[PDB]
Structures are given as C-alpha cells and as structure tokens.
Amino acid sequence: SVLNDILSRLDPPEAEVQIDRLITGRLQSLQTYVTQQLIRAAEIRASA
Amino acid sequence: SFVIRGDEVRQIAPGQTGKIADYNYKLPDDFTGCVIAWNSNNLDSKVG
C-alpha cells in the first residue's frame, strides 16, 4: 500500500507495473468520489 | 554492436537489471526496436 516501499524494494521496471495498479485504484476511487459527489450536490441544488 | 557474454543477453532488454544493464549499457523503458543476438564463437574466442 505504500508508494515508497515499491520504489525502495522493487526496481523501476518491476515497480512501474506495481504502481500502475495502485494508480488505477485510487484514480478509480476519486472517480467514484467525484461522481458520487456530483449527484449529492445536485440533490442539494434542487433543495437549494 | 556488443561483445556481451552469453548468459548476459537476457539483460539487453527494456526492463532488465544486472551488471551489463546497470554498468555498461541501459535501454530505456520505452525502448522500441529489436535485439538480435547470435554467438560469434568462431570470430572471437581463443585457447588463451
């Protein structure tokens, strides 16, 4: 789960693949967050 | 053009790590091209 350990332990050639997995997940998570965020905001707006 | 040792060939590839890859010649991760190796036993090897 830590970026530094991947860099520390693994050579970049191997690390690049590993970090990439981590990247897609968080980016996906933020994507879920914003999407989730937009909808609620809309709910608020109608209320507003 | 290289003289590289036999076992070493695996090293001449985009990701590899080792003495040849680190110290002598390094490919970029992004490398685009082929690596053509063939043992030239007759050309460069002597009894001494």
UniProtKB/Swiss-Prot annotation, chain A:
<protein>
    <recommendedName>
        <fullName>Spike protein S2'</fullName>
    </recommendedName>
</protein>
<comment type="function">
    <text>Subunit of the fusion protein that is processed upon entry into the host cell. Mediates fusion of the virion and cellular membranes by functioning as a class I viral fusion protein. Contains a viral fusion peptide that is unmasked after S2 cleavage. This cleavage can occur at the cell membrane by host TMPRSS2 or during endocytosis by host CSTL. In either case, this triggers an extensive and irreversible conformational change that leads to fusion of the viral envelope with the cellular cytoplasmic membrane, releasing viral genomic RNA into the host cell cytoplasm.</text>
</comment>
